[PDB]
Structure 1
């Protein structure tokens, strides 16, 4: 099982070797409008 809490969230990014959070599709790789990643 993965964890879903506040230390876990930042831990996952700060120390990716010990990450145990759910794995997901990055927003960039989803069917979303081009403007979604280009700020005005």
Structure 2
């Protein structure tokens, strides 16, 4: 009886999205 999870996604607003923020390029490029 945990079909409720199907709802979280339409119900429950999305987060701020990291990639759209103003940051240095290196932030998403993992290093070697």
- Give TM-score, length-normalised by structure 2: 0.48
Higher Rg of the two aligned structures:
2
Identify the structure with bigger relative contact order (alpha carbons < 8 Å, sequence gap 6+): 1
Task: Pick the structure with more helix per residue.
Answer: 1
